[PDB]
Amino acid sequence: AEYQNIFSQVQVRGPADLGMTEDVNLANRSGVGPFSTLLGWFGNAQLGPIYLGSLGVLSLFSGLMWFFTIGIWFWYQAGWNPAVFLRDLFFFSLEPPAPEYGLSFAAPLKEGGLWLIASFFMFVAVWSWWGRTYLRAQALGMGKHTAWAFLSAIWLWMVLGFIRPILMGSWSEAVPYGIFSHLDWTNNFSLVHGNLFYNPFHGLSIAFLYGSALLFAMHGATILAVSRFGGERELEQIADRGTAAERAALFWRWTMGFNATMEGIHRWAIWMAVLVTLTGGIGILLSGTVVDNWYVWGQNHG
Amino acid sequence: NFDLASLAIYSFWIFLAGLIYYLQTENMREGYPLENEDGTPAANQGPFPLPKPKTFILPHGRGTLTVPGPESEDRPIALARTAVSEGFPHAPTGDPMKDGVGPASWVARRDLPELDGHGHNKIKPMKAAAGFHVSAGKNPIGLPVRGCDLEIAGKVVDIWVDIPEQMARFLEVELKDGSTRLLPMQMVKVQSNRVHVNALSSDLFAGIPTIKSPTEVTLLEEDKICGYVAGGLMYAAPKRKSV
Amino acid sequence: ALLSFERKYRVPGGTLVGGNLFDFWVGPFYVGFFGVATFFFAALGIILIAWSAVLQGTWNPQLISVYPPALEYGLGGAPLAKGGLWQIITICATGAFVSWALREVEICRKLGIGYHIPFAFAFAILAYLTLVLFRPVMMGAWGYAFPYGIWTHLDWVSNTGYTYGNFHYNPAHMIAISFFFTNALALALHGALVLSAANPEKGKEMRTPDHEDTFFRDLVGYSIGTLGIHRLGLLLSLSAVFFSALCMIITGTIWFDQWVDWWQWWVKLPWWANIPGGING
Ligand code: BCL
Ligand code: BCL
Ligand code: BCL
Ligand SMILES: CC[C@H]1c2cc3[nH]c4c(c3C)C(=O)[C@H](C(=O)OC)c4c3nc(cc4[nH]c(cc(n2)[C@@H]1C)c(C(C)=O)c4C)[C@@H](C)[C@@H]3CCC(=O)OC/C=C(\C)CCC[C@H](C)CCC[C@H](C)CCCC(C)C
Ligand SMILES: CC[C@H]1c2cc3[nH]c4c(c3C)C(=O)[C@H](C(=O)OC)c4c3nc(cc4[nH]c(cc(n2)[C@@H]1C)c(C(C)=O)c4C)[C@@H](C)[C@@H]3CCC(=O)OC/C=C(\C)CCC[C@H](C)CCC[C@H](C)CCCC(C)C
Ligand SMILES: CCCCCCCCCCCCCCCC(=O)OC[C@H](COP(=O)(O)OCCN)OC(=O)CCCCCCC[C@H](Br)[C@@H](Br)CCCCCCCC
Ligand SMILES: CCCCCCCCCCCC[N+](C)(C)[O-]
Ligand SMILES: CCCCCCCCCCCC[N+](C)(C)[O-]
Ligand SMILES: CCCCCCCCCCCC[N+](C)(C)[O-]
Ligand SMILES: CCCCCCCCCCCC[N+](C)(C)[O-]
Ligand SMILES: CCCCCCCCCCCC[N+](C)(C)[O-]
């Protein structure tokens, strides 16, 4: 058969790639980790090095303290028996404080307090990590597109767990930490707001989520299809268009009548994705603050 | 819009229309303005205008690229109209594999090698690439190369590797006369006892474009080689036996 | 009209059917035999929908809805007004989609590229064919397929899901969702990385793929590389859809009770089954 290039036929290895320096404070990069032949059939075999400054130490520590806080709660929910822990692992839930404690921190640890602690830790972890995304870009002289893109994800998370509960006047409106419980929450949220299929922002979010799958299938299939002309080498194709970029454009022009550039496909990409959680977080932020029932809103607003 | 949701959704649609507009103009930095088949500026360019140019500063002293700008093939195109009106194909006027047309097409990219983050040639033969070796999979160096006419076209004498990405990019193949050619790795099939190249018959190998220096390739040369081998799928088909 | 670089590629050849008969373009669009097949199937498809509107008595695009054969018709045919149209429009739909994949294969042939795109598309067609064709056939009626309407199909999604309780608990649907969200993560990041290299801080030189690896290693300790990431997006997104097909092909067929209750297999496993404590004892 013709070779498809989803996995590689031959792996090559050379000296560990320690990276570009630019302005990065090299005191804080680890050494390279192992090489994995398995990853190697699909992507790069090399693992590491990683950069861990102070902001990264904070983020990880805080992140771990979150997982832990939940874990403590779970093992406790499991009466300290590991059999029960493993058995019920998807049924355990760390729930927020009752409606009765509003936005206060007055609630007992076993009945709201731990949830606040966990949320505190997750807040510090994510935000510190956000700053990492900016600073690692900066040290290398690169654009801040990643940190901006990540902000759109942060937005939906921030709306669900912090902004919306603040605007609704209680932490009881926030999502519990639990595998089954957070799915139940999601279902319940829609039931209680007149079915989220009626929320125009929900519909957009889906358009974009599905569209991201459409787009990345298109894009990735396209780069692979032109990988015999060096397609994946997108920066140099940006700087000096080659037959790879041209055949790619023309595939699409001849299929659907218009097409992209090598740099431009990546702007369609970043936005297709980012609009998922943007529109998404609007949808939710408005739910119960401005609109109690999307079926009802729909009847009065086209 | 008495209500904030209505204001929100209406504002978002306006934004999305502006975003799509902006996105589409960003994607007109190459290949535009549209042209008639004779190469002149076409009459209807569409409702989107050309963006205001941007300039990229290329690294390693290699200049800048400003797009959009004066578009030009910078090579002659051996094809001729086959109809008296727009929209039909253009017959090659000679041998399209040699002429570089159709699926054998190449672009007049820079005739320098792609450089890496440190300004070193990106691709080099593995002999010249310190500490690089095959780490997994069947090593092709030494295998006979077979074209789609089921005839031996040569032997594999090296892998050309991308240093920074640590991957195989070409196989260097020695022909009957002792010269070598690069074959894209994406167009070969490393089998246990041979390398098989479906795109080309053995007689077409000599015709693969050569590289001016035996231990680097330039972007222009990459394009001609890759163009040529891909062209074989169409143009070598009368010599492609079943399989 | 033509892109500045396009003429060199507009050579004869690559068609799968009809030799040179349809080897030509209208504007930017390649036609070919499957271009003709596609137009024919789409056109008839739309005319029937446009008619089906008439018989519903509406023209509003947010009202128009073509409903499948009522569940009592089984896997037989129904009159045009009462199901027949949907059956014929599904045939036209499949015809148009499959014809579009085969046109795509033709463009690939003419352009000398790999067949990855139409292959990718084939996964979308299969998802569709699960919903309108494989699932209904395994269940015994066209009534189980979704109807063609902007809102009515959403009505169908919700009714279908709530038949099995909270649909979230379908485990193939959990995997499917994970691939969708991870794909969107991957697309954000990939878009963002390439652009951050192509468009570096003010006054500086374009960065290099080595900057892109370095950025990700510094951040998460790993870089998949640029061949990798395109392999990845294709895999994530195709996987999202494969699990979407799977999660439905099983629902109504191997599993038809409440999905939440499926997870009882794990809970009730014999070693920890009867240990007291926890949520489940
Ligand atoms: C996949 C699981 C369910 C389903 C679940 C949902 C849910 C849930 C939602 C949608 C939504 C949409 N769905 Mg649906 N949808 C299904 C199957 C389909 C099929 C199909 C033939 O299989 C089609 C064509 C559509 C089309 C659509 C759009 C009307 C709308 C936006 C989707 C989008 O952007 O996707 C990604 C694609 C792109 C960004 C590319 C462009 C696609 C365009 C917009 C499709 C236009 C369709 C047009 C209105 C009908 C044309 C028919 C003509 C006769 C040719 N759906 C199945 C039955 N769909 C959303 C909505 O808001 O509905 C009101 C929404 O919330
Ligand atoms: C019965 C259930 C309701 C319903 C209830 C809800 C609710 C409630 C919500 C959604 C939301 C969404 N739903 Mg809905 N939804 C339904 C039906 C559907 C259907 C369908 C076919 O029926 C589809 C396709 C969707 C699709 C979607 C998405 C478009 C959207 C979530 C986007 C996203 O990426 O979130 C995922 C992305 C995030 C959550 C971002 C999180 C980022 C943070 C910063 C990450 C931190 C990670 C942390 C550090 C731990 C990680 C550890 C590391 C791995 C080491 N829904 C039905 C009608 N849906 C959300 C939305 O936007 O609505 C408008 C939402 O809030
Ligand atoms: C109350 C509703 C239930 C529910 C019930 C269901 C049901 C029921 C289904 C899903 C399905 C899905 N759901 Mg669920 N689901 C719920 C909650 C969610 C949530 C959430 C955050 O809560 C999410 C993220 C999802 C996510 C998903 C996806 C895994 C999957 C949909 C994508 C898909 O199938 O694409 C597949 C893509 C297609 C079918 C696209 C086909 C496009 C074709 C090939 C081309 C058409 C071209 C067009 C006509 C041309 C137009 C003209 C041009 C534009 C010019 N669900 C709630 C709990 N979900 C669906 C699924 O898996 O289906 C297989 C499904 O049937
Ligand atoms: C914009 C829409 C999409 C999106 C975008 C997006 N997400 C992003 C970004 C962007 C642009 C990032 O830059 C950022 C990132 O870093 O990606 C690599 C991120 C990110 N998105 C993430 C997740 C995520 N995104 C999601 C969604 C989405 N993200 C959307 C679909 C989702 C969901 C729910 O669908 C999830 C779960 C993270 C991978 C990453 C943010 C990381 C973060 O904030 O971490 C804080 C928490 C920790 C640091 C603790 C982690 C602990 C580790 C397991 C390490 C263990 C510790 C140590 C190794 C030693 C001890 C271990 C033991 C062995 C003892
Ligand atoms: C497999 C992974 C993802 C994927 C991939 C994918 N889709 C693709 C491709 C690929 C690789 C293409 O090459 C092809 C393309 O050309 O894209 C621009 C395509 C395509 N994916 C499309 C849409 C699409 N993909 C989707 C999903 C996905 N596609 C996945 C998430 C979805 C949804 C709902 O999520 C939609 C809506 C089209 C843009 C395009 C296919 C165009 C095509 O087939 O055109 C020929 C047909 C017509 C022009 C019209 C046909 C008219 C019918 C006869 C009548 C309509 C009947 C229909 C069932 C009614 C629906 C009513 C709705 C309210 C439900
Ligand atoms: C949630 C997102 C998480 C991403 C980050 C995961 C956290 C991983 C943390 C790993 C801990 C790192 C240990 C390093 C500290 C140490 O003691 O070893 C250092 C030592 C050298 O120190 P030296 O003194 O020489 O250097 C200083 C001057 N240059 O190096 C080593 O021995 C080990 C290096 C190990 C690096 C490997 C990291 C791999 C990460 Br986890 C990859 Br495999 C996984 C992430 C996948 C992608 C996740 C995101 C996907 C969306
Ligand atoms: C109000 C919280 C907002 C963010 C949503 C957090 C819920 C997702 C947690 C999923 C389950 C994690 N856990 C603890 C079970 O492992
Ligand atoms: C959501 C549906 C969007 C469909 C997009 C169709 C755009 C194709 C435009 C092709 C351009 C053809 N022409 C003659 C105007 O140049
Ligand atoms: C899939 C194609 C979507 C193209 C987006 C174009 C949106 C047009 C919105 C214009 C604003 C309309 N309105 C009434 C809200 O003002
Ligand atoms: C017939 C539906 C076609 C859908 C394509 C949508 C095109 C959006 C054009 C943006 C309009 C430009 N504007 C007015 C925002 O500046
Ligand atoms: C998500 C909706 C897809 C975007 C469709 C809008 C783009 C239409 C582009 C047609 C312009 C082509 N043209 C004339 C510049 O060659």
Ligand SMILES: [Cl-]
């Ligand atoms: Cl750090």
Ligand SMILES: [Cl-]
């Ligand atoms: Cl942008």
Ligand SMILES: [Cl-]
């Ligand atoms: Cl060098």
Ligand SMILES: [Fe+3]
């Ligand atoms: Fe890319």
Ligand SMILES: [K+]
């Ligand atoms: K070596």
